[PDB]
Amino acid sequence: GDVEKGKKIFVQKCAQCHTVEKGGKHKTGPNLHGLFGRKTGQAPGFTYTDANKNKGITWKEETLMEYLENPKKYIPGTKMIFAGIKKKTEREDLIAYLKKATNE
Numbered sequence: 001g002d003v004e005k006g007k008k009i010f011v012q013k014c015a016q017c018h019t020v021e022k023g024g025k026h027k028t029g030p031n032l033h034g035l036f037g038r039k040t041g042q043a044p045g046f047t048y049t050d051a052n053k054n055k056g057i058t059w060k061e062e063t064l065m066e067y068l069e070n071p072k073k074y075i076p077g078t079k080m081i082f083a084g085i086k087k088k089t090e091r092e093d094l095i096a097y098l099k100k101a102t103n104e
């Protein structure tokens with residue numbers, strides 16, 4: 001995935017909900033800083049749902065891949081927004097940014 005397109009995709013998709021950076025405020029989507037290398041039900045003083053915690057998986061790209069195209073598929077009690085990103089290309093680009101961004 002391209003990091004630059006990934007960056008722009010995140011900004012064009014998620015931005016006013018998630019931050020993926022150090023200082024990211026709570027809002028609706030938790031500041032996903034430290035996503036890659038953590039489990040679901042492990043949010044830094046953010047109010048979780050009985051769906052995210054129940055999952056008990058890791059985030060590393062694989063799970064994310066489906067989740068982002070199939071939010072209402074992993075668990076039908078989350079928030080269930082748009083269909084999915086665009087296709088896999090953009091999504092992969094997204095992951096590529098995310099890998100960096102969430103780390104730093």
Ligand code: HEC
Pocket residue numbers: 010013014015016017018028029030035039040041049051052059064067068078079085094
């Ligand atoms: C608010 C309007 C959101 C938008 C837009 C996006 N996400 Fe989100 N996301 C949001 C919340 C509140 C949560 C936490 C738990 C829940 O069940 O709702 C999440 C969670 C994720 C996760 C999993 C992290 C975890 O909780 O363990 C990922 C990987 C994720 N979100 C990615 C993501 C991306 C890339 C988005 C744009 C394509 C996106 N989210 C939009 C809230 C919101």
